[PDB]
Structure formats: C-alpha cells, structure tokens
C-alpha cells in the first residue's frame, strides 16, 4: 500500500520510508540459505580421513564451546544454532605427506551472524569418498 508523498526528509534520493508495523507482521520477511560441504576421501595408501567425536571437557562432562553443537558422530545436528568460530564437521586428515598420526582440519562456521542447521546430507561416491552437505538457514 503505497502513499506517494514527501515524508520526513529521509527520502530525498530514491530512499523509501517503510512502516514498522508492516515489517513486524511479515512484509519483506526473507530467508537466506547457505551451503557447507565436506569431503572425506580414501587415499592411494590405505588410509582415510575421519570424523572424531566431540572433545569433552573432563571437568564438566559437556563438550567444549567450540564443539557445542556436534552430535556423537562429529557432524552438526539439525535444529541447533551455529555461532561464529564453531565447528560443523570435526574432520581429521593423515599427515602422510608407522601408525597413523592425524592433524585436525575442522570445517568451521565463519559468519558475522548466527545460522540454524536445517538438514545434513550424507552420501558416498563409488571411490569410497564420503560426501557431507549442510544446509544453513538465516
């Protein structure tokens, strides 16, 4: 519902004044969906990327804050809210360049604002690679 008039002087050059009550009721309400994907591969040597479980705090029987939203498989769980510098997939990879020794390579949510996880997709390719895709919502 547009009134074509000059109101408040905050509309001098193409700027348009909106109504607060209309925005509260749902005018212009939008959703932004973003991706995050991780690939776990099987190398030429018989070694593999892996997802470690959440690293618990031994003193409090709860995961550390950077791991707060990880499920027991080390992949983030649908419904929970991610915040900046929090891990989504607790990936570790071999530094082969006698037993394996692993360096942590976590997929982490960089983003100035908080996002919610809607679904986590797990599928595999013929080469025994494991593919994980996260759908994120704001």
């Amino acid at each position: 519902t547009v009134a074509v008039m000059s109101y408040s002087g905050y509309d001098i050059e193409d700027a348009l004044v909106l109504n607060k009550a209309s925005l509260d009721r749902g005018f212009g309400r939008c959703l932004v969906y973003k991706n995050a994907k991780c690939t776990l591969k099987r190398y030429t040597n018989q070694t593999f990327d892996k997802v470690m479980g959440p690293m618990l705090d031994a003193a409090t029987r709860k995961p550390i804050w950077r791991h707060e939203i990880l499920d027991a498989d080390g992949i983030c769980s649908p419904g929970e809210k991610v915040e900046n510098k929090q891990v989504l997939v607790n990936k570790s990879m071999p530094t082969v360049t006698q037993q394996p020794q692993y360096k942590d390579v976590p997929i982490t949510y960089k983003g100035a604002t908080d996002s919610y996880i809607e679904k986590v997709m797990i599928s595999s390719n013929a080469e025994d690679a494991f593919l994980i895709k996260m759908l994120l919502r704001q």
Binding site: A3, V4, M5, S6, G9
Partner: protein, 99 residues
C-alpha cells in the same frame, strides 16, 4: 520579496544566499543555515502534503483539440514537400542536396 528557487538555494550557480553567507560572513554561518534548512523544510512539507497522481499528467480537452489541429497541419505541410521532391520543384537550400 520573491520565492526561493534552485537559482537561489541550489547548487547550480552563484546568486545563492549560502554563497553570499560564505563570502560575507564566513564558513560556519553557511554550514549552519544549510543544517537549519535541512531541518525546517521537511517539517513544513510533510505536514502540507505533496503528491503526484495520474490526474497531474492527464491532458485536458483544451489540449486534445489543439493537438489534433497541429498534427493535421504539420503532416499536410510535410506531404506537400514530399510531392515537391519526387514530382516537381523543391527550393533546394544552399549547401545541401535536395534530399
């Protein structure tokens, strides 16, 4: 006397009252007056009301008669010069071809 137009309050050219204030009373006086105009004129205009509508561009009957006469007169003068080029004499203006 006189209303304030673009030529007196705007950016186009001199004879601007803010330019007079700048050159005669200093930089701070010009900047204050601009801030006062930016504050005062929205308070008037938003409580006067100012709007454009389809009735502000609709041609009245005094134009629709005039426009019909102009088109008929202008097209018939063109049609005669068309005939004067293809099938007669056209007064060829100096320095240009007949077309």
């Amino acid at each position: 006397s006189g209303s304030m137009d673009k030529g007196t309050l705007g950016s186009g050219s001199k004879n601007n009252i803010f330019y007079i204030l700048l050159r005669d009373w200093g930089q701070n006086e010009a900047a204050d007056a601009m801030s006062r105009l930016a504050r005062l004129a929205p308070v008037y205009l938003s409580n006067r009301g100012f709007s454009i509508g389809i009735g502000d561009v609709t041609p009245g009957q005094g134009l629709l008669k005039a426009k019909y006469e102009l088109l008929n007169a202008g097209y018939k003068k063109c049609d005669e010069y068309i005939e004067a080029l293809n099938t007669g004499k056209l007064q060829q203006q100096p320095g240009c071809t007949a077309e």
